[PDB]
Amino acid sequence: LSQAGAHSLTPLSMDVIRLGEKTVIMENLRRVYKNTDTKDPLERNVDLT
Amino acid sequence: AMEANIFCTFDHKLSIADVGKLTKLVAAVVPIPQRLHLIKHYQLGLHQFVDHTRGYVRLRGLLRNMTLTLMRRVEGNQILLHVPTHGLLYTVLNTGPVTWEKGDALCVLPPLFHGPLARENLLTLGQWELVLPWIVPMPLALEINQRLLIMGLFSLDRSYEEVKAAVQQLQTITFRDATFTIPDPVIDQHLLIDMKTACLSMSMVANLASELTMTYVRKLALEDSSMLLVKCQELLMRLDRERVSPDDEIARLSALFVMLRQLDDLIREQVVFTVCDVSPDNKSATCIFKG
Amino acid sequence: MAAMEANIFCTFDHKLSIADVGKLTKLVAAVVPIPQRLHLIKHYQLGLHQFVDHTRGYVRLRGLLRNMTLTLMRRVEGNQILLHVPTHGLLYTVLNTGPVTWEKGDALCVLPPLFHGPLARENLLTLGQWELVLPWIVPMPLALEINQRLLIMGLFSLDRSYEEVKAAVQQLQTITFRDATFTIPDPVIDQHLLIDMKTACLSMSMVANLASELTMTYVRKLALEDSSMLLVKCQELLMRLPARPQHVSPDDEIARLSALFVMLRQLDDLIREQVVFTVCDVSPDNKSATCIFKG
Amino acid sequence: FEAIFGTFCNRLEWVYFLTSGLAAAAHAIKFHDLNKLTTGKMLFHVQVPRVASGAGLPTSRQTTIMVTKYSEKSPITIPFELSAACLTYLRETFEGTI
Amino acid sequence: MDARAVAKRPRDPADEDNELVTALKAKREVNTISVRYLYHADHQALTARFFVPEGLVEFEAQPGALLIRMETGCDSPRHLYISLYLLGIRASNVSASTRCLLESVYTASAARAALQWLDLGPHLLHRRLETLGCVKTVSLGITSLLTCVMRGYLYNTLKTEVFALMIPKDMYLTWEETRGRLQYVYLIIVYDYDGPETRPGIYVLTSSIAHWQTLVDVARGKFARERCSFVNRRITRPRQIPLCTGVIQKLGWCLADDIHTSFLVHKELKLSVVRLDNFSVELGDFREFV
Amino acid sequence: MENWSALELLPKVGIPTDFLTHVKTSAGEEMFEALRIYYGDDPERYNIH
């Protein structure tokens, strides 16, 4: 599976945080759900009893 | 490579509001008197057949000989008409008051009304008018004629208002998601001549059955081994419970069969469509064709 | 196995005369029923002729013919024939071997032949002590009455003198419908009629039971006020013998009618036949016409 | 007169899962014959290290353990209709009128 | 108009490019979606999806089974769908051993309610039912979905496999020792009228006969007993009018030679069934007979 | 009732848009006066006359 990956690469700008001396990506998904007719999976709810 | 389509041309000039009045009726059954290639708009619809004294039953029969045809496309001048081919699917407008659902055995019936409607509006040239027949589901289509025939049997006696209370019940069939009020075929107490014939078409048959059966059952009873005929005479002898030249028998039997051929128009009903998917809000639904 | 072939080749083994090879060219595009449904049927199975019998039961031919698959004649050539079976609902042309003037817009049904009278029988086409027999195509009003006349002939034959039956068979065997005269070959009584008379005699009784009291009475009551030609001519056939209805129950009455329609279809169908054609625009020659609903 | 102005049409904001940062959690790989396959699997071979025991205590076995890890299909499909009038106007062409 | 234009051979759609290709060809744009071959491009068969409750998906999950709409006087659902096999718990024709057997599998919050709707009123079952066709490729969702075949052969997509119709052995019967090279299939409801209750009597009846007149005549031999029950119910019960001894209607046709016995398998509960093979669908309107 | 059919055939400028609460809802609250919605391709746009 590791050898199946394409070797092509391109830059793209991103926001990142450095925690635990480890990089972590930040990324909104608002652009891919705005003006569409399905609920965003990240926005959910809890039923406390 | 385009599919064949009948052409049709209106004569009276149309305003742009009128040609747009017709584009709202893309899919729509349109009876055609004969499979002519050209056709005047006067031939379209049942409106050329419209009559006063002639009854609904006359529309019930001539419509069976009409060639149903969808309006595949609407433009200026010429109007296309796509005759269905058996076994292909065809989208059709739900002009019928009944809501459609999956798998209905739709069959055409002439349009009806109960006085003024919320929207009688249709395409209207001078004097000329269009009439698009209902596409009722089959089980209701039996219920229509079963009411229309019984209502004329009481037409001889409108004088008893207690009978009218039964006519008021038959007048308003109540299929689900519908509130019909079937018009009385009778007008000013007098019957239509088509109604007078349809009532004669049945009552004459039942009268001959009461007496003609008494003879032929006798000779045919002993020969039968199934015995089912032997008990048929029992109800006939109990049908008496209430209170001749050989040539006369031939003319008497001869009427009994020919009247049923006249009555057959009201009995068996061809199905013209069977539903598949239904569009939202039931504006229309596709239906595979079936002659 | 392959689905039964739409294309069927029939090849004679007997020698064909030059006079007869052109007889089939005039026969092109006509109903030629077959039974076995082979891809290469022999002509001995071709035609109705194999079903003939010394009884000559015309009612017997009426039933056995319906089981045979219909075919359309096509592509005459040198000692080769190509029958074809149209799929249901498609339109194709059909020549009329019979002598009847077809109308536009009427349904048609296959029927066993009825000899015209003179029975000149054309060249009839024969070989090997065998003759081709193609059943006639007829309009519905002729197709309907031809069955009821066979049935009423069997009712009068019962319960009456055999010499009296001949007086009724004579007037009934003739048919003057649509200009041309017709006559029924050997209308022999048969067990096939005995079951046909059975379903009619069964319907003859139950419809009297299913009929509503307001239904059978209605014709006798209409004469009290209305008068018309149809009311008088029909009233004479009936036996010689205001007021309230005894009861009016709309739910009970609508139920009586719905059952009554079923026995009518049980009774009407015996004079009905499986419609096959729905002709549109007949050709001016009246030697050919287009057809739909074939099969 | 009424005054119609310029016409407008919104353009969609193009997006790609390969460009999105959620792909850092993904490892996408095309495979044209994927419809033919039933279910994938990934066998894992494991042998745990052991420590020497003291006197009077049971000793650890040379333990070995293996597991299988399958896969989950998630098919997706999107309808879109095209009018039959668009079909008859797509390839058929009458006179070259404007 | 040109004489060469009528000399041209009739068009072959396969030689022509798909319309999705012709549009891309002019702008020479390349979409990621495949365009070279539209699927379901060549199917005379027509289909429509039928959402179903998940308590009836069993046995229907096997391709090839009859489906019928069952109209309900309730406004929701107005038309619960019914399996041909689930229908047999009510039919008297099914063997008492088989009836107790399969019924344990079909029990559900939904399917058990369907049996109650056959007892709600006097009206006969044939009025309440309407044949739909047969399933191919079940979706098997939490809300079950089925691709019924309105007409034509049952088969897997791309013609990779031809699904066969499945019919229970308890309902199947043969009218003749000599099967023809072709024979039509007929679903046929029958009613053996009786005092306390009029039981349904379902039967599947393949036959070489096709004409309606010849078919009903031979039908009266096997069913003469139920025919005797009909008139018997009339004479016993004045002011009572039962109707229709039964209903015949066309269902399709089969090659006859392909027929052979088979069996369904589910929940370690095998059930032997007749197995029609290349059953092209040809639905027919109900035709009552007395 | 404006002639919507002309808008579906006449060339149009491509303007990206940003607005709250989704176009299906903002037109579901009738923020605009005249408006029209439909599913799928519109046959009516092809009926030039």
Q: Write a three-state SS string for C94-133.
A: EECCCCCCCCCCCEEEEECCCCCCCCCCCCCCECCCCECC
Partners of residue E185 on adjacent β-strands: E252
Partners of residue B107 on adjacent β-strands: B136
Q: Identify the residue whose tokens are 């009077």.
A: D56
Q: Which residues contact E238 (CB under 8 A, 6 or more apart)?
A: none
Partners for E (CB, 8 Å, 3+ pairs)? B, C, D
Report phi then psi at C9, rounded to 5.
Answer: -105, 125
In angstroms, what is the resolution?
A: 3.9
- Which chain B residues touch F if contact means CB-CB below 8 Å? 16, 19, 23, 26, 74-76
Facing residue for C198 by CB, picked from B218, B229, B251: B229
Parallel/antiparallel/unpaired status of strands E203-206 and E183-192 = antiparallel
CA E15 to chain centre: 36
| Closest among E81, E119, E102, E260 to E179, alpha carbons compared | E260
For residue D13, the chain A residues in CB contact (below 8 A) are 31
Facing residue for A14 by CB, picked from D21, D27, D29: D21
CA distance B41 to B10: 5
Residue C180's CB: how many other CB atoms inside 10 A? 14
| Closest among C217, C221, C165 to C189, alpha carbons compared | C165
Q: Give helix C58-67 / helix C191-210 axis angle, nearest 10°.
A: 90
3-state helix, strand, coil in chain F (%, to 5): 30, 5, 65
Phi-psi region of E244 (alpha: psi -120 to 50; beta: other; left: phi over 0): left
Residue D13's CB: how many other CB atoms inside 10 A? 11
CA distance E284 to E252: 8
Nearest-Cα residue of chain C relative to residue B215:
C159
* Element containing residue E225 per DSSP (H, E): helix E224-236
Report phi then psi at B26, rounded to 5.
Answer: -65, -85
Q: Identify the residue whose tokens are 């149209």.
A: C86
CA distance B106 to B56: 19
The burial class, CB within 10 Å (0-12 / 13-18 / 19+), for E146 is buried
Q: Please check whether residue D26 is in contact with residue F32, taking contact to mean a CB–CB distance below 8 angstroms.
A: no
Q: What is the 3-state secondary structure (H, E, C) of B18-72?
A: HHHHHHCCCCCCCCCCCCCCCCEHHHCCCHHHCCCCCCHHHHHHHHHHCCCCECC
For residue F15, the chain D residues in CB contact (below 8 A) are 8-11
CA distance E156 to E158: 7
CA distance B81 to B69: 6
- Which chain F residues touch B if contact means CB-CB below 8 Å? 43-44, 47, 49
What SS3 class is residue C197? helix
CA distance E127 to E288: 10
Min Cα separation C156/chain E (Å)? 23
| Closest among F37, E184, B211, B208 to C219, alpha carbons compared | B208
What SS3 class is residue B175? coil
Strands (E), C98-256: 107-111, 136-139, 174-175, 182-183
Give the side-chain half-sphere CA count within 13 A for C168. 26
CA distance B280 to B260: 43
CA dihedral E98, E100, E102, E107 (to 10 degrees): 160
Q: Please check whether residue E147 is in contact with residue E137, taking contact to mean a CB–CB distance below 8 angstroms.
A: yes
* Element containing residue E274 per DSSP (H, E): strand E271-276
Q: Please check whether residue C292 is in contact with residue C89, taking contact to mean a CB–CB distance below 8 angstroms.
A: yes
Nearest-Cα residue of chain B relative to residue E288:
B268
The burial class, CB within 10 Å (0-12 / 13-18 / 19+), for C171 is exposed
Assess A35–F contact: CB distance below 8 Å, yes or no: yes
Flag if F49 and B75 touch (Cβ within 8 Å).
Answer: yes
Name which of A34, A37, A39, A43 to mutate to probe chain F: the one with the most chain F Cβ atoms within 10 A of its Cβ.
A34
Distances from the Cα of B36 to the Cα of B8, C242, E164, E274, angstroms: 10, 54, 44, 49
Nearest-Cα residue of chain F relative to residue A33:
F22
Assess F40–D contact: CB distance below 8 Å, yes or no: yes
Backbone Cα Rg of chain F: 13
Q: How far apart are the first and last CA of chain C?
A: 22
For residue D19, the chain A residues in CB contact (below 8 A) are 12
Q: Count chain A–chain D contacts defined by CB atoms under 8 A.
A: 19
Question: Within chain C, how many helices (H) and strands (E) appear?
Answer: 9, 9
Partners of residue D53 on adjacent β-strands: none
Assess D78–A contact: CB distance below 8 Å, yes or no: no
CA distance B135 to B52: 23
Assess D29–A contact: CB distance below 8 Å, yes or no: yes
Residue B129's CB: how many other CB atoms inside 10 A? 13
CA distance C246 to C239: 22
Q: Which residues contact C151 (CB under 8 A, 6 or more apart)?
A: B257, C193, C196, C197, C200, C270, C271
- Range E23-59 burial, b when 16+ CB lie within 10 A, else e: ebeeeeeeeeeebeeeeeeeeebbbbebebbebbbbb
CA distance C60 to C191: 9
Q: How far apart are the first and last CA of chain E?
A: 59
Distances from the Cα of E153 to the Cα of E20, E53, E85, E187, angstroms: 28, 26, 21, 18
Q: Which residues contact C102 (CB under 8 A, 6 or more apart)?
A: C96, C108, C139, C279, C282, C286, C289
Q: What is the DSSP string of B178-217?
A: ----PPPS-SSSPPPHHHHHHHHHHHHHHHHHHHHHHHHH
Structure tokens at E163: 């699904």
Distances from the Cα of C275 to the Cα of B273, C76, E281, angstroms: 19, 27, 22
Partners for F (CB, 8 Å, 3+ pairs)? A, B, D
Report phi then psi at B49, rounded to 5.
Answer: -85, 0
* Element containing residue D67 per DSSP (H, E): strand D65-69
Return the ∠ at Cα D81 (arms to D76 and D82), rounded to 5°. Answer: 140
CA distance B249 to B267: 27
Assess C206–E contact: CB distance below 8 Å, yes or no: yes
The burial class, CB within 10 Å (0-12 / 13-18 / 19+), for B92 is buried
What is the biggest distance separating any 2 CA atoms in chain E, rounded to whole angstroms? 82
Report phi then psi at D29, rounded to 5.
Answer: -145, 120
Q: What is the DSSP string of C42-78?
A: BTTTSSGGGG--TT--HHHHHHHHHHSBP-B----BT
Min Cα separation B9/chain D (Å)? 20
Structure tokens at E174: 């043969």
Backbone Cα Rg of chain A: 17
Number of residues written out for chain A? 49
Q: What is the DSSP string of E49-82?
A: EEEE-GGG-TTTTSS--EEEEEE-SSSSSSEEEE
| Closest among B68, B76, B62 to B27, alpha carbons compared | B68
Residue B240 amino acid letter: D
Min Cα separation B271/chain E (Å)? 8
Flag if B257 and C222 touch (Cβ within 8 Å).
Answer: no
Q: Please check whether residue B289 is in contact with residue B231, taking contact to mean a CB–CB distance below 8 angstroms.
A: no
CA distance E59 to E63: 8
Report phi then psi at C131, rounded to 5.
Answer: -130, 135
CA distance B67 to B32: 5
Report phi then psi at C202, rounded to 5.
Answer: -70, -45
Question: Structure solved using which method?
Answer: cryo-EM
Q: Which DSSP category does E87 fall into?
A: G
Assess B241–E contact: CB distance below 8 Å, yes or no: no
Flag if E255 and C1 touch (Cβ within 8 Å).
Answer: yes
Return the ∠ at Cα E50 (arms to E49 and E54), rounded to 5°. Answer: 130
What SS3 class is residue E196? coil
Q: Give helix C140-157 / helix C162-173 axis angle, nearest 10°.
A: 170
Q: What is the DSSP string of E89-156?
A: GT-TTS-HHHHHHHHHHH--TTHHHHHHTTSS-SS-HHHHEEEEEEEES----SSEEEEEEEEE----
| Closest among E88, E145, E93 to E118, alpha carbons compared | E88
| Closest among B107, B148, C275, C293 to E285, alpha carbons compared | B107
Parallel/antiparallel/unpaired status of strands E199-200 and E183-192 = antiparallel
Q: Which DSSP category does B288 fall into?
A: E
Backbone Cα Rg of chain D: 31
Residue B29's CB: how many other CB atoms inside 10 A? 23
Distances from the Cα of C91 to the Cα of C9, C37, C57, C233, angstroms: 22, 22, 34, 43
Q: Which residues contact B180 (CB under 8 A, 6 or more apart)?
A: B97, B114, B172, B173, B174
What is the biggest distance separating any 2 CA atoms in chain F, rounded to whole angstroms? 39
**Contacts by residues A22-29 (CB-CB < 8 Å, ≥ 24 positions apart):** A25/D21, A25/D24, A26/D21, A27/D20, A27/D21, A27/D22, A29/D20, A29/D22
Q: Which DSSP category does E205 fall into?
A: E
For residue A26, the chain D residues in CB contact (below 8 A) are 21
Nearest-Cα residue of chain E relative to residue D84:
E19
**Contacts by residues D64-68 (CB-CB < 8 Å, ≥ 24 positions apart):** D67/D43, D68/D41, D68/D42, D68/D43, D68/D44
For residue B203, the chain C residues in CB contact (below 8 A) are 215-219
Partners of residue E129 on adjacent β-strands: E70
| Closest among B80, B9, B69 to B34, alpha carbons compared | B69
Flag if B35 and C281 touch (Cβ within 8 Å).
Answer: yes
Q: What is the 3-state secondary structure (H, E, C) of F28-48?
A: CCCCCCCCCCCCCCCHHHHCC
* Element containing residue A24 per DSSP (H, E): strand A22-26
Q: Give helix E224-236 / helix E212-222 axis angle, nearest 10°.
A: 80
Structure tokens at C211: 């009929």
CA distance C31 to C42: 17
Chains C and E touch (3+ CB pairs under 8 A): yes
Structure tokens at E286: 């109900």
For residue C269, the chain E residues in CB contact (below 8 A) are 212-213
Name which of D9, D13, D87 to mutate to probe chain F: the one with the most chain F Cβ atoms within 10 A of its Cβ.
D9
Structure tokens at C205: 């009784």
Q: Please check whether residue C61 is in contact with residue C41, taking contact to mean a CB–CB distance below 8 angstroms.
A: no
Flag if B209 and C214 touch (Cβ within 8 Å).
Answer: no
Q: Please check whether residue C67 is in contact with residue C48, taking contact to mean a CB–CB distance below 8 angstroms.
A: no
Flag if E214 and C209 touch (Cβ within 8 Å).
Answer: no
Q: Please check whether residue B105 is in contact with residue B274, taking contact to mean a CB–CB distance below 8 angstroms.
A: yes
Min Cα separation F47/chain A (Å)? 30
| Closest among B143, B167, B170 to B154, alpha carbons compared | B167
CA distance B279 to C102: 43
Min Cα separation B73/chain F (Å)? 9
Parallel/antiparallel/unpaired status of strands D8-9 and F13-14 = parallel
Q: How far apart are the first and last CA of chain D?
A: 28
CA distance D82 to E18: 14
Min Cα separation F37/chain D (Å)? 15
Residue C167's CB: how many other CB atoms inside 10 A? 15
